[PDB]
Design a protein around this ligand. Structure first.
Ligand code: HEM
Length: 105
């Protein structure tokens, strides 16, 4: 898995960044699919969410290692994705965010 993070601060970053397009609640989809239970989940499977062609076809499984790269440069990991976030350059913010994602299960 990815570098060690802080879920408390991760919640803070989730709710100041991710929350603009996603939710941390199960099954509740907005502009983006719910991130509840995302860790370990296969891409494009959140019920009722309208995924892009790229995401569905990806064949990605959201492990910590992958989420770490993706959050940094989404287009590099899912070329053609419709997730508009330029990316998170701070590696510690990415580890904290993932740390928080991990509790959502
Ligand atoms: C916050 C820093 C943040 C995270 C974390 C995040 C994650 C994420 C994942 C893991 C996916 C794929 C999940 C799956 O396959 O089910 C995904 C997808 C979308 N996102 Fe995202 N995302 C974060 C931030 C943001 C922000 C700020 C926006 C909106 C400006 C956004 C949007 C989207 C969209 C749309 C998708 C679906 C992509 C597609 O089908 O191509 N995310 N995000």
């Amino acid at each position: 898995s990815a570098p060690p993070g802080d879920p408390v601060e991760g919640k803070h970053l989730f709710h100041t960044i991710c929350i603009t397009c996603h939710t941390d609640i199960k099954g509740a989809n907005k502009v983006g699919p719910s991130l509840y239970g995302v860790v370990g989940r296969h891409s494009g499977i959140e019920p009722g969410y309208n995924y892009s062609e790229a995401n569905i076809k990806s064949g990605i499984v959201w492990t910590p290692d992958v989420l770490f790269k993706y959050i940094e440069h989404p287009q590099k990991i899912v070329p053609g994705t419709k997730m508009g976030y330029p990316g998170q350059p701070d590696p510690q913010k990415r580890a904290d965010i993932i740390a928080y994602l991990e509790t959502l299960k």
